Nucleic acid binder design. Structure first.
Ligand SMILES: Nc1ncnc2c1ncn2[C@@H]1O[C@H](COP(=O)(O)OP(=O)(O)OP(=O)(O)O)[C@@H](O)[C@H]1O
Ligand SMILES: [Mg+2]
Ligand SMILES: [Mg+2]
Lengths: 335, 246, 94, 212, 233, 134, 99, 198
DNA sequence: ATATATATATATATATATATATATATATAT
DNA sequence: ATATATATATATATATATATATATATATAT
């Protein structure tokens, strides 16, 4: 979203380890003081003046300072790389010792920076988790948690770089050695290099080309070209959508049966599906009988259980009307 | 925020449907009809408009869901008629923009039942234009005709304000559809597309898909590259140590 | 020191991502995406996206705004970090 | 005895030809690909059976040759059973520049990873800008359209060299590459401290380099 | 290097565990069949916790295994996984694949689906021990969880003004009873998700829109006739 | 060994007379769920008939094996498909057990309403039965 | 009908042909602790009332296994139902399944 | 180790030339007596040797041998143009029965050119040369040159044996049947060939 | 400026080898 | 005269390697 913000704005136009140690010590002291103040507790104003004004600003500023020191170390890394590159241009075989030395001091400085970083990373993390624990003493301390979540990453982030840089440098270092072991070993006097340069400059005075094997490619049979189906389809366009309505007759019947049946649950009277169905089906014509029976059963089985079902004695198929309709159900007793 | 919504789904010249537009519902749309009515065809049209990859589209019966039947046919070719077919989804964005995404499908002539799909998108179309009419030409006495992609492009470009785009790849299609809030995830890779299709296919057949429940890790937890870089660093260290030992 | 509107917006986006980046490292694979987004927002196409991104990144690197480190495994085979001058210019407004 | 490999083929040659790596390696070699130390598996395979494979390829009237730098390749003879081809003059220029960058310490910070832009900058630095453009187009006089054309030609030649194994694109990036020792062949005309016109004659006699 | 790998794996595992467990509270007791709820069970696996501890503390004791020219890095990791924790009894799969699996942090979390079936507590949801409708409900719950996760993970790339469309299908919705379908409808309405369901019968007569399709053979071809259905008349 | 079996000399296919088209090979993906279910049940009844005819020569002359088949999730079929299934099974004297989640209400046969419940802290299926309607 | 534990696999209707996914065959959970029975009653063409069946039992142990013992009863009177043979009507509320 | 008969086949002094010509896509018919006999004798092993390259050594029903690359071919593959396939089918047609009285096994470039013009559709001819062309001298000259180029390309494959001289007059081999269509009971070869070409 | 050829990666289905668990007949301790 | 342990056969399903088809990027040539 910041792109529009920038567009409307319309704007345009110290590697010493003793330092890092002293900032780390200051940070540890201040963090411990803030953590203890938070742990002791206080009112909203005390919580503020002890965990939001002192902690926030100080930790932010000094972590930014430590990151700035790391950035300065990165700048020194770049400059030493450039110095090695320039030195190898002027002495060639005689700069090997100089380049190896420079690599040695840079590597030692990186390792010392990592050591100083890890000299206090663990304790700072412990104090930060302590502040996390003590933060919950009030409901308005939400912002504190953010710092206790932010100042984590930065710290860890810092430590990460302290290793990553070495991981990078230990790589670059190797390459340089490889270069000396590969580029200059076979060009000790560099004469091959100057002579190649002049050949490049004066190549077209004797244009020559190398020879390479150029075996033939295995010609293949082209697959048949794919032709789609075209028929200019035409047809009647649909009319406006019609509509149909759903019959709620079954809803009315179900409500009727539910009202007729709730009395059994109210009175806890033993319900017998046989007799109830036989009585109730007499009120409807034969074709509807099924659609009644089902519904009635659905309403009856929600009302308690039948205790006889655990007796192991099967129930009989009681007739519930003429024409041969039957029902199998024990009396419903336990409501 | 007001979530975007699928307003309708249009099938032109499908098996049974010549030109039919179902107006989907904000919450639930139900399709009813006896066996062989054409409901699964409607969902097939929708899915094809959504994920037009022909490596994925496989319309097995609801029975044998995921079970290899050895049919050799994905079941899409039979659902289309000869000629040009369309399948378009009309979507109202969170920004209140009516965007008509879709595909043009068309059978390939020959014994093999192979289909050809070309996606496309339409932006800025007026709310008074229905996709059923936009894709057909009234030729004859109430006897409209289906017009191909080139004619559709000519017809749309002649209109004012409408932007018609045709995509040379499915990746660009999905990128545009994600930019306009029609897909949750950005399907940059083929695996992302496969996972999206797995999700919609699992919903279509309903319930616990074997493929999903076997990779719930790949579907829920995100990929992390820090762990992979750390493993590469350890691998390099081990390689150097092995070199020295040898 | 010469930051047109597009370069300044790209630098600010880089700073924001670095602030929200986990471990404070930026591979060029994300720098290209950020430049793509800023250029898309500014609505100008002088050349391809890739060439513009590469030219801007190189200009800032030589203008002492970014530091580059060659790491093959990293996405894009390079890792970029804001330089102190770049940090100052970015945080002057942020 | 009969039904015995030694009747027709040496045991080690048969083992080499039956190795899982042989077919792809052979196809790549016949395609013109040079093999460097980077291809650890293929390079070691060639090293182990260098003589067996050399005698096998001799049957095609082509020499499997290992340059002193340690990279193998194929040099067809005039009677080659496998066709032969010559690099373009622009390819020779770009290969010489790549060898220079391999030997150049100024680019040490790159750590071997180079972009086509840097290659073109070095090319124009060491070559004659407009007169090099002349080959790109006969009617160029510094026009920026011809400038882009020369850039595209350099990119195409870089891709071709990648096909020859002189250069590797990075596992994920096609806009960056790492040079390989094979490029040293582009300097074979100057590795010996003699008169250029005599070394050129020696090379052309040996089959290394035809003229244009 | 091994210590760093183990530490980063542990940090990522903890972060994902917390995210998933927080997400779990986004479900509100779906009533599908006898299944009364659905939940995600994420837990760091002990068989992999031991491996992480070994990588973090005792790398040098197993160097007989890592620097063997026969075993690659993935195979070496697989063999180390076999070495300690020998009761797991992995199957016919090769060491290479089971090592390439070990190089992925997600495999360090057991990530299962639990269902609160009836009154037996939260049980691992296995299709062999669930009704068809119960399994359909559980699967749809998992799918909506996946969609929510995808949408949340893209909240950064997307603009602040676009919320993506949500839609899912259900073919053969007649396999669900009235209670399950009502639960699905309410769950989707809560999640702002659209559903397209198919069933031979008007299984949802009083919600959303409904169409009825009738296929007619007509002069040696087939034509489908669509008519809307309304709740009341 | 395959050649020694006469069945391997025979090519068998299932064909369906679908709509306005002629007889087509029965492909699972080229059919709807209901059509596939019907075709499967037809093939199953054929297989049962074939087995009974094969074994009749090795049974008592007056033994007619019982025939029964299931159909789970029968709600996937519409009313017409279910009617056709019942007619086909009645013609062949085959018994059917169909499971429907209350969606269908076939009027002919026996019907069993099941309802799961908790009783005495144990799960219990209250079952009621009807028959004879129609 | 088919008391074979190799074939009996009561997978879910969805995933009708899909692979196992798990290792359980789905039968153990459908049973209860004790002695279970599954009996078919059949009337032949000869009009013999044959009661075929199996006795099922959760094999106590680490896994979820079952033990099936088939049996057949011939000549039963038509006035005795299968639920009367297998349950003793003790004086308690609920009957007792006998092994 | 290696199969013994495979080693015998590889060691044979004919193997290098034949291998180069196969990897170049050339078709070895009955005319090449030595090569055809070698392939006949050692097919059972050369099929495996060339399957190691993800290629298939195929003996056509007519008898001629060739190499068919798979999708995973380790030998750099290539595809013939559309004009190439048209000319191949034209030559397959000209491998006719009336051919005996027409040209006695020796054809000339003019026959192929006239057959291609008369038989093919104009749109495909323009697609070959260029779309905007319409019955012009320069377009026809370019078409004739491209016809000669594709004839040379086919010669590389062994489909057409040039009569040795700079002039373009050649003979057609049986391997050309690769371009041909399948033969059914009672079908006229000319009619089916023309139906395929159309 | 765009059609076309080419290389690479992924999903999907086939076919084969193999370990697991169950059923059946026999052997041998109880 | 019995029940448990063995050997055999079988189906299940698990995993790998192969081959195919599709999508993609992109590098050439008119
Ligand atoms: N690939 C195909 N090829 C040929 N016919 C097809 C194909 N797919 C579907 N059909 C036919 O289209 C018609 C509709 O089938 P469809 O799958 O849409 O049904 P449905 O609505 O899912 O029905 P059901 O409720 O039975 O599942 C049926 O005649 C079916 O045979
Ligand atoms: Mg269906
Ligand atoms: Mg069920």
């Amino acid at each position: 979203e910041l792109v529009s913000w920038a567009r409307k704005n319309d704007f345009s136009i110290e590697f010493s380890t003793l330092r890092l140690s002293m900032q780390l010590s200051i940070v540890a002291n201040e963090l411990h003081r803030a953590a203890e103040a938070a742990e002791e507790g206080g009112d909203e104003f005390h919580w503020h003046r002890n965990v939001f004004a002192p902690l926030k600003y100080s930790v932010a500023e000094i972590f930014d300072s430590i990151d700035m020191s790391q950035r300065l170390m990165d700048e020194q890394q770049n400059f030493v790389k450039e110095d090695i590159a320039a030195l190898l241009n002027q002495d060639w075989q005689a700069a090997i010792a100089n380049c190896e030395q420079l690599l040695s001091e840079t590597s030692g400085t990186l390792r010392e920076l990592q050591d100083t970083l890890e000299a206090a990373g663990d304790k700072l993390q412990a104090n930060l988790l302590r502040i996390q624990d003590a933060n919950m003493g009030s409901g308005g301390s939400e912002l504190v948690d953010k710092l206790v979540f932010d100042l984590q990453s930065k710290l860890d982030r810092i430590i990460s770089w302290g290793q990553q840089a070495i991981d990078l440098w230990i790589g670059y270092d190797r390459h340089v050695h490889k270069f000396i072991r590969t580029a200059i070993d076979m060009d000790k006097n560099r004469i091959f290099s100057q002579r190649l340069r002049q050949s490049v400059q004066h190549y077209f005075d004797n244009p020559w080309t190398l020879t390479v094997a150029n075996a033939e490619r295995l010609l293949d049979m082209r697959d048949e070209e794919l032709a789609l189906r075209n028929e200019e389809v035409t047809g009647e366009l649909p009319l406006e959508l019609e509509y149909e309505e759903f019959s709620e007759i079954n809803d009315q019947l179900a409500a009727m049966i539910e009202k007729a049946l709730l009395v059994y649950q109210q009175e806890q009277r033993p319900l017998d599906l046989g007799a109830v169905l036989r009585d109730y089906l007499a009120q409807h014509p034969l074709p509807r009988h099924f659609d009644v029976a089902r519904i009635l059963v659905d309403q009856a089985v929600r009302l308690g259980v039948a205790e006889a079902d655990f007796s192991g004695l099967p129930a009989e198929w009681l007739a519930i009307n003429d024409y041969g309709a039957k029902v199998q159900a024990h009396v419903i007793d336990t409501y | 925020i007001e979530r975007g919504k699928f307003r309708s789904l249009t099938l032109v010249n499908w098996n049974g449907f010549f030109a039919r537009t179902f107006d989907l519902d904000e919450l639930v749309t139900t399709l009813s009809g006896g066996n062989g009515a054409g409901k699964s065809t409607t969902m097939a049209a929708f899915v094809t408009a959504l994920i037009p990859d022909l490596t994925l589209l496989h319309f097995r019966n609801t029975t044998e869901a995921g079970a290899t039947s050895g049919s050799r046919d994905k079941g899409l070719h039979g659902k289309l008629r000869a000629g040009v077919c369309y399948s378009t989804l009309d979507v109202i964005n969170s920004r209140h923009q009516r965007v008509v995404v879709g595909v043009r499908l068309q059978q390939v002539a020959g014994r093999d039942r192979k289909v050809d799909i070309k996606p496309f998108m339409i932006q800025g179309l007026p709310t008074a234009i229905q996709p059923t009419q936009l894709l057909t030409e009234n030729v004859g006495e109430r006897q409209a005709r289906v017009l191909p992609l080139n004619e559709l492009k000519d017809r749309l470009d002649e209109m004012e304000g409408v932007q018609f785009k045709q995509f040379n790849s499915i990746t660009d299609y999905h990128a545009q559809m994600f930019d306009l809030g029609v897909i949750p995830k950005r399907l940059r890779s083929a695996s992302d597309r496969s996972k999206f299709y797995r999700l919609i296919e699992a919903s279509l057949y309903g319930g616990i898909s074997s493929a999903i429940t076997r990779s719930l890790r790949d579907y829920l937890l995100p990929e992390n590259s820090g762990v992979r870089k750390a493993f590469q660093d350890m691998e390099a260290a081990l390689r150097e140590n092995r070199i020295t030992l040898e | 020191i010469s930051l047109p509107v597009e370069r300044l917006a790209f630098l600010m986006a880089i700073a924001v991502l670095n602030s929200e980046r986990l471990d404070g490292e930026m591979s060029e694979g994300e720098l290209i995406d950020a430049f793509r987004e800023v250029c898309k927002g500014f609505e100008q196409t002088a050349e391809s996206v890739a060439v513009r991104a590469n030219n801007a990144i190189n200009d800032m690197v030589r203008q002492k705004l970014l530091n580059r480190f060659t790491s093959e495994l990293a996405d894009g085979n390079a890792i970029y970090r804001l330089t102190p001058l770049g940090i100052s210019i970015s945080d002057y407004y942020i | 005895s009969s039904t015995h490999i030694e009747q027709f083929m040496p045991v080690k040659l048969a083992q080499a030809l039956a190795n899982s790596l042989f077919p792809e390696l052979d196809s790549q070699l016949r395609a013109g690909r040079h093999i460097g130390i980077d291809d650890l598996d293929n390079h070691a395979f060639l090293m182990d059976f260098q003589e067996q494979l050399e005698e096998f390829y001799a049957r095609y009237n082509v020499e499997l040759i290992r340059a002193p730098e340690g990279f193998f390749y194929l040099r067809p003879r005039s009677t080659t059973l496998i066709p032969r081809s010559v690099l373009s003059e622009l390819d020779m220029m770009v290969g010489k520049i790549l060898c220079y960058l391999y030997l150049s310490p100024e680019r040490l910070a790159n750590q071997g990873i180079f972009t086509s832009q840097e290659l073109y900058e070095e090319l124009i630095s060491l070559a004659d800008e407009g007169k090099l453009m002349k080959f790109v187009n006969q009617r160029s006089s510094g026009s920026d359209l011809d400038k882009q054309k020369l850039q595209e030609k350099v990119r195409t030649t870089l891709n071709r060299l990648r096909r020859l194994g002189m250069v590797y694109f990075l596992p994920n990036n096609n806009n960056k590459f790492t040079i390989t020792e094979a490029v040293f062949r582009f300097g074979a005309d100057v590795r010996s401290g003699d008169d250029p016109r005599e070394i050129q004659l020696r090379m052309i006699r040996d089959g290394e380099a035809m003229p244009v | 290097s091994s210590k760093s790998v183990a530490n980063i794996i542990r940090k990522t595992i903890q972060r994902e565990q917390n995210r998933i467990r927080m997400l779990n509270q986004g479900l509100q007791a779906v009533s599908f069949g006898q299944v009364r709820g659905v939940r995600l069970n994420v837990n760091v696996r002990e068989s992999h916790a031991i491996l992480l501890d070994v990588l973090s503390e005792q790398q040098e004791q197993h160097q007989d295994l890592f620097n063997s020219q026969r075993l690659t890095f993935s195979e070496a990791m697989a063999k180390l996984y076999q070495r300690l924790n020998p009761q797991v009894d992995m199957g016919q799969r090769l060491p290479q694949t089971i090592g390439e699996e070990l190089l992925d942090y997600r495999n360090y979390l057991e990530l299962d689906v639990e269902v609160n079936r009836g009154s037996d507590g939260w049980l691992k949801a296995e299709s062999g021990a669930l009704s068809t409708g119960e399994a359909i409900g559980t699967g749809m719950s998992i799918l909506v969880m996946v969609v929510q996760s995808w949408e949340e993970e893209s909240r950064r790339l997307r603009g602040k003004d676009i919320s993506p469309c949500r839609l899912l299908f259900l073919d053969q919705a007649a396999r669900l009873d009235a209670k399950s379908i009502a639960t699905l409808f309410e769950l989707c309405e809560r999640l702002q998700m659209q559903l397209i369901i198919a069933a031979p019968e008007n299984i949802s007569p009083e919600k959303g829109t409904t169409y009825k399709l009738v296929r007619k053979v007509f002069k040696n071809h087939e034509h489908v006739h669509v008519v809307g259905l309304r709740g009341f008349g």
